[PDB]
């Protein structure tokens, strides 16, 4: 699973309690200058390594 709380999806979470990975394009993070980063909802295992 990816970003979220209570099991629901969320753009700002500091944690991974979200829906199961779709591969479906979703938003994340804050809005800057009326724009926002949008990316495949996919896991990234190495992201700390």
């Amino acid at each position: 699973f990816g970003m979220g709380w209570n099991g629901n999806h969320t753009e700002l979470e500091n944690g991974s309690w979200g829906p199961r990975f779709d591969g479906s394009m979703q938003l994340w993070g804050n809005v800057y200058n009326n724009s926002q980063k949008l990316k495949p909802y996919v896991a990234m295992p190495d992201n700390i390594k």
């Binding site: 709380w5 979470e13 500091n14 944690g15 309690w17």
Partner: peptide, 10 residues
């Protein structure tokens, strides 16, 4: 006599 942790956000 001890020490406090804090929880996080979510």
């Amino acid at each position: 006599g001890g020490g406090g942790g804090g929880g996080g956000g979510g």
